[PDB]
Amino acid sequence: ATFEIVNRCSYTVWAAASKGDAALDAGGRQLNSGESWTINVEPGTNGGKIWARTDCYFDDSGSGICKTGDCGGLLRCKRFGRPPTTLAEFSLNQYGKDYIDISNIKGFNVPMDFSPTTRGCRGVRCAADIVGQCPAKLKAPGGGCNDACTVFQTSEYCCTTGKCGPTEYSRFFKRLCPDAFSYVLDKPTTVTCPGSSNYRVTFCPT
């Protein structure tokens, strides 16, 4: 239920944590280079996500915009963020176990390591330079590397009908980051941890 969010990047990021219809803990917070933010996530949180946001500007009330991962213009995120967003995904206390993964299904913006701080399982990582190697048609002018579903809005890329295969675009993400989901029906890279494990999300783990 504790997630330590550490920014090893050389640039500032604004962390965000949500399960889609509500914030987790405060939902969001600035993290300058090297800073750590420990949040509490309620047990049994299903479909929670943590991500980084880049190039944000927020007013005194906490309203503004980010070039990647913006969540309705709020500093304290109440909903998921606009792609591209490397995603740390987690569902806790599901019939006795935690389940974690990293997903590039909504694009890539910041490299990420997602690891337990307690025993019983391994971590996952996507720390390759996906933005620098991004295919031209996936490059997001605002920053990051978009997934093909946000770029092209096709049943095949978005897996709308629950039937879809890998694509030239999903194989790029999978080549650079095998341990992260590259498309909806990707062979699962989910890691089963003991129920009520604790975690650490490190941006730019290097």
Q: Token pair for residue 143?
A: 């920053």
Q: Is 67 left (phi over 0), alpha (psi -120 to 50) or beta?
A: alpha
Tell me which method was used to determine the 3D structure. Answer: X-ray
Contacts 24+ apart (CB under 8 A), 34-38: 34/7, 34/8, 35/6, 35/7, 36/4, 36/5, 36/6, 36/7, 37/4, 37/5, 37/6, 38/2, 38/3, 38/4, 38/5
- Residue 179 near residue 125, CB atoms below 8 Å: yes
CATH class given for the domain over 1-206: mainly beta
3-state secondary structure the chain: CEEEEEECCCCCEEEEEECCCCEEEEEEEEECCCCEEEEECCCCCCCEEEEEEEEEEECCCCEEEEEECCCCCECCCCCCCCCCCCEEEEEEEECCEEEEEEECCCCECCCEEEEECCCCCCCEEECCCCCCCCCHHHECCCCCECCHHHHHCCHHHHCCCCCCCCCHHHHHHHHHCCCCECCCCCCCCCEEEECCCCEEEEECCC
Burial 105-144, CB ≥16 within 10 A → b, else e: bbbbbbbbbbbbeeeebebbbbbbebbeebeeebebeebb
CA 76 to chain centre: 16
* Cis status of the peptide bond prior to 43, with omega within 30 of 0: no
Half-sphere exposure of 33 (CA within 13 A, CB side): 3
Q: In this structure, what token pair is assigned to residue 117?
A: 């701080």
* Rounded Cα–Cα distance for residues 47 and 56 (Å): 25
For the stretch 176-202, what's the b/e string if a residue is b when 16 or more beta carbons lie within 10 angstroms of its beta carbon?
bbebbbbbbebeebebebeeebebbbb
Interior/surface letters 42-60, b for 16+ CB within 10 angstroms, e for the rest: eeebeebbbbbbbbbebee
Spatial CA neighbour of 52 closest among 126, 2, 1, 117: 126
Domain residue limits, the chain: 1-206
Torsional class of 170: left (φ above 0), alpha (ψ -120 to 50), beta (otherwise): alpha
